[PDB]
Design a protein around this nucleic acid. Structure first.
Ligand SMILES: [Mg+2]
Ligand SMILES: [Mg+2]
Ligand SMILES: [Mg+2]
Ligand SMILES: [Mg+2]
Lengths: 49, 452, 34, 249, 34, 290, 49, 55
RNA sequence: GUGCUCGCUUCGGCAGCACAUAUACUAAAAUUGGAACGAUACAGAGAAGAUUAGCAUGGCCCCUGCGCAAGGAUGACACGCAAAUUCGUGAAGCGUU
């Protein structure tokens, strides 16, 4: 991951692992994973933008 | 982005300006005390008074005038009233004024440095005294018993800062050699002994073009690039006379006749050759039947005739001070001739023709071009290679801009040696008439060599 | 002379990128001539 | 060599520069510029050249290739390894990268490095032939412990009966018959009831025929036939031929 | 490096956004509707 | 163009009074290095001393870590040729027009990813400021810099404005001096700075410890000891710098002699110690003994 | 402690500097890694199809 | 960034028609692995147009 | 410098108070470096046999125009064309005999 992110900040997401290639499974339409930010954060980011 | 007030900063700045010490401003988290910084003991003895706060000063107020009547027609200096202890015209020293005119020339100031610690020798005698410590008479008349080709470097003079344009042998001795460099220096090296540079002459505003040694050897006429030449002495080194027609001279030759050794003939690029007396100083006669740049003119037939060359291919033999070019030569095939040297027999004018080869003519007989004497193998187109003859008329020396010192057997018309003379344009290749092996070279290379 | 990109070639590597280095000993490495 | 040569260089350089200026896409000009440089032996020039070309198109296998080929022919071996790892980092699913990396590592001798790069490589579970060259590499050495570790990993990332078979193949040849027995057990109990079929079992019966245990050859044969999905018809004729074999021999 | 050149078309024009009013179809009524 | 907080220059160029006054103009003129518009801050140097101004892009500065007005390095303060060589530093900055513009553009792009604290690149991986640089470094503020030019009027006589000659009315320097015409661009590029060659000649003639002939002369005479020294103190001067084999502290002549266990260790200690191994203030002389 | 003052810009002053300078585009970014499925070479039959 | 006015309407239609082709199949329904001969499928396209026009 | 001190205090000064508070690319220069599309001359005009209309694409080429319009020989330059590719050369590597 260093050779990948070479000369780059800790912001960059650099997918080079197989554990990214592997299909995750999800079966809950009621997980946290499948939930958007709630509109309070949304109005904050609207105002900043 | 600290926030401060200003009036106190301006008071601090007034102090720090006119009293020279300041309330130290460092706002360190290490609690310093209020300390006077700068001229510390000045603030201490002055009790810290700032340039703004009133305090007693018996300092002499600079002497001023006061004309405050605005009724005067030419009066009111009023608010603008000069201080009375001031000068009228701020004129800087006559010394720096003369030096500034001289420097405005320098970018010509006649400037001479003798590198010899004692300018005259152990008798009080100027180095114009020809040696007796010589192993052979440098005042002899006869040709060397046998001059040959060189095989090793002898000495190299460093002391010119750029390309050299001439080396003049002091007549009849070869004990002095003036070396003219593009850096405007005419530096005479003692050609024997230590080989070290003797005199350094300057005074031009540009490159040092040529110098001609007088038949007395005490004088030399040096033409340059900025339209003027100097008739200079040797031991004082300065110009006794100034030659100037405001024209661009390329070469100059000093007449050897003792009753005419003041008669100097300086070629000018404007069709001209000037015949001028040093003593009077004006042009005494004109030779204006050339076409343009007259590269060089030389003596012939007891020096009462002058040979000339042109880049217009006009080659001339016309008597000294007789202004009618009564012997003219310009062939269809003959190309520019830069340099012409008379064989020490006085029978031939060997002129390096810029067709990359040297041509010999009979200088005593009817302007005859001897094609049996045609020296081959140089590259002289664009360069003025100074070629010469040894005293025995057996050997010729020749330069090429390719670094080539060629040592030819002038009879067999072929070279016996071809070696590295210079790195830049090998300009002067001069055979010594009283030395057997000596080939002295100057060039655009700034190093001045003897080979033997 | 007035040659605005002519000498970019005989003089310098025209637009240069230094080979990025990774996990190995590159300094004392060097090469022989022609 | 002062200036006739030098100006010939100046020309050819200016040309290549203008051709890549026009396109700066398709790469033949980039290459030919660079190889001309390498033939004139200025590898600093050629290096910057390959970096720029790689910038414009970092998905070019031939570009990566001949870059590293320059580095290897000039044995800046450290530089070459950096090149190879960057390659196999950005274009992993290209195989010849991995290959040439190993091969050069091998004639370099750093076989510890070769092992770990093969571990890297297999993290992607590349390919059958990849595994197989891994194993031929390991058995250029004694390292049979390694080899069976790799057959372990390979047959168990890849559910193939013939993979099982080649594992027991190597056990038989390098003479580990007890391990061959374990692997036949494991294989048949993993493949098992449903989609397990003839050929692993014919191989088992044949190995025990090498063992000349005829009664257990019979029992394994008919017991497997009967316990698992039996037969189909051409394979059953093959079962009849193999039956004559197992009974006679 | 911001130039001072300019354009007839970039002169200020249409400087207020018409917001969609109450009766036309505001995002509120879209929040409601069936 | 660029945008700044304040300039970057040495103390000499920077000033003396506690309150400095400098006026700012955004996009004021062109960095003769970055070639593009920069900001220009103009500082009042000293009493009747020439007002200076910022004379290089702040990125053109952070490139080589030198003074945006004084032009000398900010750590030592010697010609950039010198300071670079004193770090043994070898920068590849491109020169031709298009090459230089491309270089400057990507340089500003790469410097945009910085935090504004220290120069970029080898400027840190060459931060072993050698005692050569330390010793060539000037000590006090050579504040002759803020004196004006030669008032060409006042050189010919003409400067009729009284004392207000805009320039120092002194004798003008003979430009034959190599210390006269150093083109600012060349001085920045480290290109044949005659003042830098003078610093090379000076730091070449400046005294350093001498090497002996035979390798088996591993005895080192340190002259000028005094009787405040200990044998363990001579050791702690030359002890972990290698291994010492023996030491003779000559009190009848106020010297010392370290016989070493590593020749290169002896060289390290002594050559680094030449006249400057100042423990408790005594000027010792490190040499190889007889 | 330093006083910064902003120097007047003269109103009737034309632009000062030649803005329109062209150079090639700077080198891009650290290339991403190609996270591709295993790619299959085609039969020569397919190839001729 | 000049507009498309009245004299570049046909020229522009063809820039974009043949761009669209080159996007469309000759690089998104290949499997002519080598080098997909897009320069020649475009030559067909221009001869298909000439033949339509000449019937 | 201007005023006033119930200042000495004469109409001389000295003094105190107040008031009044920081200009300025310092230069008349001296430098130093490139173009003038002008001469000079060389040069010397897209596609298909000839004679010719154009509109574009690409970019470390520009010019005239307020211009995102239009023009400048279709403004100029773009020119090897690589290219694989058809048969064989070989090397590397895995598997069978
Ligand atoms: Mg045609
Ligand atoms: Mg047009
Ligand atoms: Mg037209
Ligand atoms: Mg066009």
């Amino acid at each position: 991951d260093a050779i990948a992110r070479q000369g780059q900040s800790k912001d960059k997401v650099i997918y080079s692992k197989y554990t990214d290639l592997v299909p995750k499974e999800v079966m809950n339409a009621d997980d946290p994973d499948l939930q958007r930010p709630d509109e309070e954060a949304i109005k904050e980011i609207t105002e900043k933008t | 982005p600290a926030h401060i007030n200003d009036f106190m900063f301006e008071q601090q700045r007034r102090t720090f300006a006119t009293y020279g010490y300041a309330l130290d401003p460092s706002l360190d988290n290490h609690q310093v005390s209020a300390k006077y910084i700068g001229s510390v003991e000045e603030a201490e003895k002055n009790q810290g008074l700032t340039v703004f706060e009133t305090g007693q000063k018996k300092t002499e107020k600079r002497k001023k005038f006061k004309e405050n009547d605005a009724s005067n027609i030419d009066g009111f200096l009023g608010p603008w009233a000069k201080y009375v202890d001031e000068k009228d015209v701020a004129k800087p020293s006559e010394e720096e004024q003369k030096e500034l005119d001289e420097i405005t020339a320098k970018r010509g100031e006649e400037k001479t440095i003798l590198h010899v610690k004692e300018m005259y020798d152990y008798q009080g005698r100027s180095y114009l005294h020809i040696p007796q410590d010589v192993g052979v008479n440098l005042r002899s008349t006869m040709p060397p018993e046998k001059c040959y080709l060189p095989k090793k470097q002898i000495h190299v003079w460093s002391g010119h800062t750029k390309g050299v344009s001439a080396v003049r042998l002091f007549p009849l001795s070869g004990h002095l050699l003036l070396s003219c460099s593009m850096d405007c220096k005419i530096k005479l090296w003692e050609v024997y002994g230590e080989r070290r540079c003797l005199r350094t002459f300057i005074g031009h505003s540009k490159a040092v073009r040529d110098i001609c040694f007088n038949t007395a050897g005490t004088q030399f006429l040096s033409a340059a690039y900025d339209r003027y030449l100097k008739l200079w002495d040797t031991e004082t080194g300065q110009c006794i006379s100034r030659f100037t027609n405001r024209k661009v001279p390329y070469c100059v030759k000093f007449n050897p006749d003792e009753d005419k050794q003041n008669l100097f003939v300086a070629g000018m690029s404007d069709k001209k050759i000037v015949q001028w007396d040093i003593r009077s100083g004006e042009i005494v006669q004109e030779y204006d039947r050339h076409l343009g740049a007259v590269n060089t003119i030389v003596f012939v037939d007891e020096n009462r005739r002058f040979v000339s060359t042109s880049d217009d291919k006009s080659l001339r033999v016309w008597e000294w001070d007789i202004p009618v070019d009564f012997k003219y030569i310009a062939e269809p095939s003959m190309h520019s001739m830069p340099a012409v040297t008379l064989s020490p027999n006085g029978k031939w004018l060997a002129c390096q023709s810029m067709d990359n080869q040297i041509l010999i003519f009979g200088a005593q007989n009817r302007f005859r071009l001897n094609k049996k004497k045609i020296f081959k193998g140089h590259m002289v187109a664009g360069y003025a290679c100074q070629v010469d003859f040894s005293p025995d008329m057996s050997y010729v020396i020749s330069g090429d801009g390719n670094g080539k010192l060629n040592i030819w057997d002038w009879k067999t018309t072929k070279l016996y040696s071809r070696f590295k003379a210079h790195d830049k344009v090998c300009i002067g290749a001069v055979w010594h008439p009283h030395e057997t092996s000596k080939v002295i070279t100057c060039g655009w290379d700034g190093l001045i060599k003897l080979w033997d | 002379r007035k040659r605005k990109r002519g000498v970019d070639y005989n003089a310098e590597i025209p637009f240069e990128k230094k080979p990025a280095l990774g996990f190995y000993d590159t300094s004392e490495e060097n090469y022989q001539a022609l | 060599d002062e200036e006739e040569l030098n100006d010939y260089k100046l020309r050819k350089r200016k040309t290549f520069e203008d051709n890549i200026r026009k396109n700066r896409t398709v790469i033949s000009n980039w290459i030919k510029y660079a190889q001309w440089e390498e033939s004139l032996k200025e590898i600093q020039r050629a290096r910057s050249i390959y970096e720029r070309a790689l910038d414009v198109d970092y998905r070019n296998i031939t570009l990566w290739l001949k870059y590293a080929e320059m580095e290897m022919k000039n044995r800046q071996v450290n530089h070459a390894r950096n090149i190879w790892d960057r390659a196999i980092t950005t274009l992993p699913r290209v195989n010849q990268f991995w290959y040439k990396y190993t091969y050069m590592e091998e004639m370099l001798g750093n076989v510890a490095g070769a092992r770990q790069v093969f571990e890297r490589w297999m993290e992607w579970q590349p390919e059958e032939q990849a595994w197989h060259s891994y194993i031929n590499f390991e058995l250029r050495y004694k390292e049979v412990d390694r080899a069976r570790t790799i057959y372990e990993r390979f047959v168990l990332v890849h559910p193939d009966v013939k993979n099982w078979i080649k594992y027991a193949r190597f056990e038989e040849k390098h003479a580990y018959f007890a391990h061959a027995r374990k692997v036949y057990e494991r294989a048949v109990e993993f493949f098992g009831d449903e989609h397990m079929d003839e050929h692993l079992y014919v191989a088992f019966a044949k190995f025990e025929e090498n063992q000349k245990e005829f009664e257990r050859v019979r029992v394994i044969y008919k017991y497997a036939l009967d316990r698992i999905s039996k037969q189909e018809l051409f394979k059953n004729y093959t079962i009849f031929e193999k039956k004559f074999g197992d009974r006679r021999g | 490096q911001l130039s001072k050149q300019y354009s007839s078309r970039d002169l200020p024009s249409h400087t207020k956004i018409k917001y969609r009013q109450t009766t036309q179809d505001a995002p509120e009524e879209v929040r409601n509707r069936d | 163009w660029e945008d700044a907080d304040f300039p970057i220059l040495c103390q000499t160029c920077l000033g003396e009074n506690p309150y400095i006054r400098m006026t700012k103009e955004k996009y004021g003129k062109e960095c003769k290095i970055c070639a593009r518009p920069f900001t220009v801050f103009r500082w009042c140097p000293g009493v009747r001393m020439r007002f200076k101004k910022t004379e290089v892009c702040q990125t053109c500065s952070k490139l080589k870590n030198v003074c945006q007005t004084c032009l000398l390095d900010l750590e030592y303060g010697l010609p950039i040729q010198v300071r670079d060589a004193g770090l043994s530093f070898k920068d590849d900055m491109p020169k031709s027009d298009v090459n230089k513009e491309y270089y400057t553009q990507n340089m500003e792009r790469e410097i945009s990813n910085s935090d504004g604290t220290r120069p970029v690149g080898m400027l840190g991986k060459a931060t072993s400021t050698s005692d050569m640089l330390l010793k060539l470094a000037r000590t006090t503020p050579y504040y002759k810099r803020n004196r004006p030019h030669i008032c060409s009027f006042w050189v010919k006589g003409e400067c009729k404005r009284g004392e207000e000659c805009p320039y120092r009315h002194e004798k003008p320097t003979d430009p034959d001096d190599p210390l006269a015409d150093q083109n600012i661009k060349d001085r920045y590029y480290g290109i044949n700075d005659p003042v830098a060659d003078k610093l090379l000649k000076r730091a070449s003639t400046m005294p350093r410890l001498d090497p002996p002939e035979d390798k088996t002369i591993t005895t080192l005479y340190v002259g000028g000891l005094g009787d405040t020294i200990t044998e363990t103190d001579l050791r702690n001067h030359f002890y972990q710098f290698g291994e010492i084999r023996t030491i003779t502290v000559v009190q009848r002549q106020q010297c010392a002699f370290i016989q070493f266990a590593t020749r290169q260790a002896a060289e390290v200690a002594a050559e680094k110690s030449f006249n400057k191994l100042i423990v408790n203030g005594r000027r010792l002389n490190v040499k190889w003994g007889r | 402690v330093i006083r910064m003052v902003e120097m007047q810009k003269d109103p009737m002053e034309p632009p000062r500097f030649k803005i329109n300078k062209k150079i090639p585009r700077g080198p891009p970014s650290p290339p991403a890694p190609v996270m591709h499925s295993p790619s299959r070479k085609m039969t020569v039959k397919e190839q001729q199809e | 960034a000049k507009t498309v006015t009245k004299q570049r309407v046909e020229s522009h239609f063809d820039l974009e028609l043949r761009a669209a082709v080159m996007h469309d199949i000759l690089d998104m329904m290949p499997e002519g692995i080598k080098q997909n001969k897009a320069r020649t499928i475009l030559q067909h396209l221009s001869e298909a147009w000439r033949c339509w026009k000449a019937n």
